[PDB]
Amino acid sequence: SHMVHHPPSYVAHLASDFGVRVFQQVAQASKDRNVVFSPYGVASVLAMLQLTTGGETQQQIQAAMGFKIDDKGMAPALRHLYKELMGPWNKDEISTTDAIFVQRDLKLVQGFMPHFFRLFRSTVKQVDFSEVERARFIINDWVKTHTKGMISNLLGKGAVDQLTRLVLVNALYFNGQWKTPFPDSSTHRRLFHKSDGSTVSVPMMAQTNKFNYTEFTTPDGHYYDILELPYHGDTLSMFIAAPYEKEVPLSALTNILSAQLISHWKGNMTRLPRLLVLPKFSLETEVDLRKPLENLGMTDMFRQFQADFTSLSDQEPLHVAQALQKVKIEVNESGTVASSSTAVIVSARMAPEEIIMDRPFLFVVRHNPTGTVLFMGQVMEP
Ligand SMILES: CC(C)(C)OC(=O)N1CC(Nc2nc3ncccc3c(=O)[nH]2)C1
Fold this sequence. Notes:
Layout: H1 11-29, E1 35-37, H2 39-52, H3 55-65, H4 74-86, E2 93-103, H5 112-120, E3 125-127, H6 132-146, E4 166-177, E5 188-193, E6 199-217, E7 223-230, E8 236-243, H7 251-254, H8 259-267, E9 270-279, E10 282-288, H9 290-295, E11 322-331, E12 335-345, E13 360-367, E14 372-380
This protein binds the ligand CC(C)(C)OC(=O)N1CC(Nc2nc3ncccc3c(=O)[nH]2)C1.
The ligand CC(C)(C)OC(=O)N1CC(Nc2nc3ncccc3c(=O)[nH]2)C1 binds at residues 11, 15, 40, 43-44, 47, 78, 81-82, 96-98, 120-122.
Family: Belongs to the serpin family.
Main location: secreted
Protein name: Plasminogen activator inhibitor 1
């Protein structure tokens, strides 16, 4: 069973593994980067890109993701995966939506509409991008809606222009209540010692409970606590990995990180009494994916005369200028609220990346019945 898999029956893991690998690229770019990410959000947009691209452009994408979205049986597996995530038995709220915004006078290949509907239950949204500010507002309002108001201005000044012809977006929203809330009385400020010899007062939470816990050591010998913090629906939890030593950089963990690794942790954990100290944080970040996707073999889609979008339209040539992801998380005593908006844009440009860096720990938000990794991030260590 570990060596042989039926791909549609394994799509959750495959999509999660691909999305994790994209996070590694983002993490490997900057040391100790405080960033929040959605593996599931990037997998959903790139899966859409498998329907829109053709030729080598599509080949390259299917290769990196390590599965084909149009394989026999994928459709019913995707319907089942959506239901499992969305259903009310989860208690904690999850919401995922996908959209393709396309220049209105653009003739699309006949076979595209049924595919997009079979796999994404979605319908291409025609917009006239030559009306730049209106179009920016149309896509922005849609993102603001499907993230429940959390991401209001994904697309700022210059993110789209008259030459924009295609935008693909996924909006992902998560709202969970801890199974056991952290008690208000044990919230306190704690000091964090920066590298420049200075200090900052950070609000800290704490709770003692029986937590699924495991120890973990890497090939080079470095130790980490892995604790699982559950949401009240019993289907979702936050896995937390924290290093034992201040001399071990988090890259020793993130460089070997995988979806199977997290599955192995969850599989090999035991319930133990532990005190948990976790920060009360809000993190908002936006990462470029162009380079990270280029590093994983997907270069054709960004290149003016090599790019092949013929499964969507052979009417006119198209290539990707921007691939990005804007993400927001808020963790308090009663729970977590997180959202992400993943976008691939033709034309215009992406403002330079703003990067914050500070010795971090790792968190993973994971839907357990399916193995779907929804959010993961590197945040400031207590
Ligand atoms: C596994 C992978 C990340 C490739 O895709 C999925 O998990 N699927 C969920 C499907 N997306 C989807 N499914 C939907 N189902 C009903 C209503 C709306 C939607 C929608 O907007 N998107 C694709």
